[PDB]
Structures are given as structure tokens and as C-alpha cells.
Swiss-Prot record:
Classification via InterPro entries: WD40_repeat_dom_sf, WDR74/Nsa1
Organism of this sequence: Saccharomyces cerevisiae (strain ATCC 204508 / S288c)
Family of this protein: Belongs to the NSA1 family.
Quaternary structure and interacting proteins, as annotated: Component of the pre-66S ribosomal particle. Interacts with NOP7, RRP1 and RRP5.
Note: Present with 2740 molecules/cell in log phase SD medium.
Protein's recorded name: Ribosome biogenesis protein NSA1
GO biological process, one term: ribosomal large subunit biogenesis
Length: 372
């Protein structure tokens, strides 16, 4: 299989080529065929996010406040296989507002489009297009309420997106197709005080949409369903037909153990999500998510908050900075302990473990082809 790993320590991207069963910590196991650095820009400009447009092209968003267009080419290496080369063809810069530490939380297509969104923690929503001259051009920079932990586009209809942050209630926003204007259409409410009559803090960290609620729907209310993971160990479930308060807020771990990330998954490894990771279902009872704490654990929960078991419990020793469910059956994992890992979703089995010599914050799987 072919992976790209964002190595923050060198501000670079490494291509990793290895077969299933690879484990660089066990010398008797399979070892990688190829690891090489690319586009090293230093700790001052490490990659925040990537999005692969095709096998020939990708787009990067760097912690220097720069979005780059990348051309990917293949070369025969001189056990036969090709290796990649990367050339930056266009870029857009000064996309941060540290004065309002900034970073890119979202980098994904808006919809034939050539148009992408790039959202910052400082509450900037940049719209960037690959024009006919094949150059990147910024179409707009819309302002949101800071701070922003996440921005999730809605791509499941049966443009709309949700965003939120520290003491920044979840908001649904409608943006015009000109990208020059947006309108807030919904804001969540906090839940009641707890058993000790104390205010429940608000800190949504990640959100995934579900399909609209079924049955007959009331006029005057939207019909959007979504679930969110909070920084206070909550699983919050929303249905706008019910109201602005969540219809359920569930404590996932004791003592409000902080959490980040939310990856939808099916227990048998089926691909049940949209291109942006939204759950293609209308029932919360089928929802399962993967999340991480700031210690070393990777947790799996069902829609009711039951812990379904940990991933790499005995192998992961550092905080899992990045997780991603790829095409239903793969879990990409990388974090502070500097090993890039691939797990099987259904069997929970670790398929790949490769030391990359740097902290990891993003991984993409270009293909899963075995090399022979």
C-alpha cells in the first residue's frame, strides 16, 4: 500500500510503501520497500491538512497560513514499484489571523467544481478555486465566530455547514453559491445544570451529520441530524426538528476526560459514509464513532455511548493526534509516538506499523495495492 504521512518535525510529507504485515519494530516482520521525504519546509510550516484530488494532484494546507496545489507524478525506482514526486504549482498565503495558535481545521471540496474550503481556528472561511489557468485563486474570506475547532460541510441531501469551538455553541450556516455571503440559520443551546446544579461547559470538538429525521416533519423548523464529540467527554446528539438543545448528551468517560476527533465506522468495515465523512443513515442506533483522548488511547463507541473496545491498546504509547476511517475498512492512525499505523476495522488487527521519525498529524492512503 501507498501512504503519505505529514511529519511535523521536518514540516514535510513522507511517502511510505509497504505490504500488509509490515512492522518496523519487529525485525522478523515485513519491512517497508520505500520511505522518502518530500516538500520539507520546516517546523514553521508543517502540513495541517491534505486532500487528494486524484492520483495526479493534491492540495495542502500548511501551518504557515499557506494553501498549496501539488502535482503528483510517478517514477520507476532504481520487487518492482513506482515512487512519487511532488511539485508545487500554485499557492495562496496569509490565510491566518493569530491576533484574534491558528491552524487549518478543514480542507475539502465544496462539491466539476475545482473549488475548496479552508477554515481556520481563528474563524476564517476561505474559498479557493483552481481556475482555468490551473492556478489557485481565492474567491472569498468569510468571517465566523472564533474560536473554531471544526467546520463540517453537509453533503448528504435527502451550501450548509456546521462549526463550533470552546464555549462556542454549534451553529448551522448557509453560504451562498457566490461564496460572498453567509447567514446563520441555527444555534445550539446548552443542556440543563447537572446533578450538582452546575453549568455544563461547552466545547464541541468534532461533528458528523446524519440524514434528515424520517416521518412527517414540522413546518417552521429545519430537519438536520448530527452528533458531536466534546472536549468534556460528551457524545451530543442533535435533531433540529426536536429543537436547539440536544436530545441526548452522554458522558463517555469518567471525570470529563478530554476528547478530540470523531470518525464514523461500521462494525464490519462497510463504507457507510459520504465523501466528507457524514453518516449515510437516519437512525442514531446504527452510529458508531472512533475518538481519541490526549493520553494514548483510541476509543470506539456506539450511538448510545457504550465503549466498544480500544484500538492498539498495547502498541500505541503516545497521543493519537490523527485518526481517519478510510473507505470503511481501514483506520489510519498517527501521533506523538512517531509510528504510522493501519488497523483493520472489523478485526481490530494492526496491519501496518512503520516508524517515520517524527510526530504525525495527518495521513492519507493513496492506494492499498500489494507489491509483488
Amino acid at each position: 500500500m501507498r501512504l503519505l504521512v505529514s511529519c511535523v518535525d521536518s514540516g514535510s510529507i513522507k511517502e511510505v510503501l509497504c505490504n500488509i504485515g509490515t512492522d518496523t519494530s519487529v525485525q522478523s516482520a515485513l519491512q517497508p520497500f520505500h520511505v522518502a521525504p518530500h516538500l520539507a519546509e520546516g517546523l514553521k510550516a508543517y502540513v495541517d491538512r491534505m486532500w487528494v484530488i486524484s492520483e495526479d494532484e493534491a492540495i495542502l494546507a500548511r501551518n504557515s497560513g499557506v494553501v498549496e496545489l501539488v502535482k503528483i507524478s510517478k517514477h520507476l525506482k532504481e520487487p518492482k514499484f513506482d515512487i512519487s514526486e511532488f511539485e508545487i504549482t500554485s499557492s495562496v498565503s496569509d490565510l491566518f489571523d493569530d491576533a484574534k495558535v491558528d491552524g487549518f481545521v478543514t480542507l475539502c471540496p465544496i462539491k466539476s467544481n475545482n473549488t475548496f474550503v479552508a477554515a481556520t481556528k481563528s474563524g476564517l472561511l476561505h474559498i479557493i478555486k483552481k481556475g482555468e489557468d490551473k492556478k489557485l485563486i481565492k474567491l472569498a474570506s468569510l468571517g465566523l465566530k472564533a474560536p473554531v475547532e471544526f467546520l463540517q460541510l453537509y453533503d448528504l441531501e435527502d451550501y450548509i455547514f456546521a462549526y463550533g469551538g470552546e464555549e462556542n455553541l454549534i451553529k448551522l450556516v448557509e453560504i451562498d453559491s457566490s461564496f460572498q455571503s453567509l447567514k446563520q440559520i441555527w444555534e445550539a443551546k446548552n443542556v440543563k445544570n447537572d446533578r450538582l446544579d452546575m453549568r455544563v461547559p461547552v466545547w464541541p470538538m468534532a461533528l458528523r451529520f446524519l440524514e434528515p429525521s424520517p416521518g412527517k416533519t414540522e413546518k417552521g423548523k429545519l430537519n438536520y441530524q448530527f452528533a458531536a464529540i466534546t472536549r468534556w467527554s460528551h457524545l451530543t446528539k442533535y435533531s433540529t426538528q426536536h429543537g436547539r438543545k440536544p436530545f441526548a448528551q452522554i458522558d463517555l468517560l469518567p471525570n470529563r476526560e478530554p476528547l478530540s476527533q470523531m470518525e464514523v465506522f461500521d462494525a464490519k468495515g462497510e463504507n457507510v459514509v459520504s465523501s466528507l465523512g457524514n453518516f449515510q443513515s437516519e437512525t442514531f442506533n446504527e452510529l458508531n464513532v472512533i475518538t481519541t483522548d490526549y493520553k494514548k488511547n483510541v476509543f470506539k463507541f456506539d450511538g448510545n455511548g457504550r465503549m466498544l473496545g480500544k484500538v492498539g491498546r498495547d502498541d500505541i504509547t503516545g497521543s493519537s493526534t490523527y485518526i481517519h476511517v478510510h473507505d470503511g475498512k481501514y483506520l489510519l492512525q498517527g501521533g506523538l509516538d512517531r509510528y504510522v499505523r493501519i488497523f483493520d476495522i472489523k478485526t481490530n488487527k494492526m496491519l501496518v506499523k512503520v516508524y517515520v521519525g517524527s510526530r504525525i498529524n495527518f495521513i492519507v492512503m493513496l492506494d492499498d495495492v500489494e507489491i509483488e
